[PDB]
Design a protein around this ligand. Structure first.
Ligand SMILES: [Zn+2]
Ligand SMILES: [Zn+2]
Ligand SMILES: [Zn+2]
Ligand SMILES: [Zn+2]
Lengths: 98, 19
């Protein structure tokens, strides 16, 4: 299966690209702006089917914080430590922060 | 550094996808 890029259109090998498990299609880091890491290399749910780690529902992209290194979804209104507002800075794991 | 995190990742995805 070519599993061409989900959002960019183009064929690619299945090993050096992020392969979404649910969707079945892989994609380049540049297209979705995802850092190349072993955790995501295995295959992280692309933003097209991402879910909150609290309610397991998508949407609220501007109000949802996603980890740069690992794949985790945090809702500004129901994340692990709930916040009263949207952080002006980045809110992800320490490694994710950098 | 801004909420560009998922905001830029998924929202831009819509721009390139919907395009
Ligand atoms: Zn691509
Ligand atoms: Zn997916
Ligand atoms: Zn993280
Ligand atoms: Zn949530």
């Amino acid at each position: 299966g070519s599993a061409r890029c989900a959002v960019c259109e183009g064929p690619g090998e299945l090993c050096d690209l992020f392969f979404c498990t649910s969707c079945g299609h892989h994609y380049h880091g540049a297209c979705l702006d995802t850092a190349l890491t072993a955790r995501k290399r295995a295959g992280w749910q692309c933003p097209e089917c991402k879910v909150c780690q609290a309610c397991r529902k998508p949407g609220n992209d501007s109000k949802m914080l996603v980890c740069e290194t690992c794949d985790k979804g945090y809702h500004t209104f129901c994340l692990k430590p709930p916040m009263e507002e949207l952080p002006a800075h980045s809110w992800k794991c320490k490694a994710c922060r950098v | 550094t801004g909420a560009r995190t998922l905001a830029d990742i998924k929202a831009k995805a819509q721009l390139v996808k919907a395009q």
